[model samples]
Target: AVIFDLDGVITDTAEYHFLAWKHIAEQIDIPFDRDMNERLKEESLESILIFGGAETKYTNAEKQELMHRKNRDYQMLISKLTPEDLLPGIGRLLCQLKNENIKIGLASSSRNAPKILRRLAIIDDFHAIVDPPDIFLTAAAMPADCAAIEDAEAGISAIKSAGMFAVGVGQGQPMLGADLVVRQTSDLTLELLHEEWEQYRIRES
Candidate 1:
């Protein structure tokens, strides 16, 4: 089983997420930038608020309201996404995985995974769309053991903590705690996965 994260790994909605959060920050006079947006990907709404230096400026109720507002903005931004938004090589990789009869699952923090998948015309590529809280739970139920592929450091950590092989897909330094790192989804050939997993099994043995 191969469990994938939706945002950066399957699609590039990171920009929309950043734009939405940035819009909200601008409204509240909070400073925000791409660097802050990168950190926000792995953080919760409250954590983002604090990281943006907005926690002390707003009351609890106000913070909640802002969170809701940010989500609305994000939803609107994502509504514009089409199949063209999928990250380079993601479509090809998904098709290749399907052809190989690999069981693919989607694990995303976004509640809109189904909608996003539908928009991208790839909803059927996944065997299951695991809920954010049930990612590890769902993977554990697979007949065969699973590996998780993610582009974020936090996601890699979660997969590692769950005792799964973690493959990081992204440019730059390899994700912290990832067993294998690839620059893009295209870099992950079926043979490469088999070789990597074989190595992992050997190490474990």
Candidate 2:
């Protein structure tokens, strides 16, 4: 059983997200620069909004409206993705894992998760999905403990709750509580997994 993160892991949505954030900044009369993006590397959209002083300026409802607008724009841009956009070696690796009978799950914090999966045509490949509360925003309904660690942690806890081994991608490496950390989905070859699992089994034994 293996759980993976989307965005920087399975798809190349990271760039799209950066672009969307920049456009959002423009809409709000703020400058979106590389330094600001660097600061936002692993932070959630909610956290970024608050951290960048947007929270102080806008009411909660206003903040949500802005976030929603930005997400809609992001969906439009990413909806054009095709199978060719999947990272290198991902197709082969997915086949290999399926042959090995590994259970696959996708744990993403993105609100446009279903659209992204549908566009990539990999929705069938994943056995489960652990997205945010509404697929658009984190919900207050989740366990307070889960929410305390931020967005990625909430997804991580959800995956672990399903009893699957986690393979965290991107900035999720540390916060996702994954058993394996791959820079990209294609990096997760069976050979590497087997070796790592063998070591883990030995330790457990």
Q: RMSD to native for every prediction?
A: 3.5, 6.9
TM-score of 2: 0.68
Ten contiguous residues minimizing lDDT sum, candidate 1: 136-145
Which residue pairs in candidate 1 have backbone atoms (N, alpha carbon, C) closer than 3 angstroms, thus clashing? none
TM-score of 1: 0.79
lDDT of each: 0.78, 0.61
Model 2 ranges with Cα > 4 A deviation: 42-57, 133-184
Per-residue accuracy of model 2 over 34-131 as CA lDDT, tens digit each: 67777766135555556666756767678778888887888888977888777665667777768877655565676787778878777777666765
Candidate 1 lDDT over residue span 1-205, tens digit each: 7788888788888778779878977888767788867765414555666766766787777777888888788878788889988877678877877998878888788877888898898898887886652465465664335777898887888888778788998755547588999988778866788789988878877
> Distance (Å) between predicted and true CA of 69, model 1?
1.7
lDDT for position 106 in model 2:
60
